[PDB]
Amino acid sequence: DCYLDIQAGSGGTEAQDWASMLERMYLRWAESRGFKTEIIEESEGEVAGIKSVTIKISGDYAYGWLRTETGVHRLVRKSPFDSGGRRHTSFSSAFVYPEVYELEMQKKNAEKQAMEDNKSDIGWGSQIRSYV
């Protein structure tokens, strides 16, 4: 049963509002299909919205449908919270991972370190889906 982690970045209020919008979007996706909407870790925004959330998805082929859903999401939208009434290009990541002595722990971490360096070396291909 896979976990999905939604994180807000670079924005004080604009990103947290977008992270909360993306939080509700994935929960309604799980509710419609027939998956468990259990939340393990949650943190609300400093002003308004959500800073970070970790939602567990349980059922049949959980990671199989949420495999391509992984990546940074772009939102090109006006802010209702900004006084100036400005247009904002804000980002939120949606890292999805499936569910799983000191020498073995370090070797597992070093294999993980090399894996993340390979994913990041591609470029800004993490920006997978744009919202306007």
């Binding site: 970045g9 992984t70 940074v72 949606a94 890292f95 994913k119 990041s120 920006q127």
Partner: peptide, 16 residues
Amino acid sequence: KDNAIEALLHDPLFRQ
């Protein structure tokens, strides 16, 4: 070390 997608999210490439 931990997450690549989340690391790029918190750098000036994915700016506000």
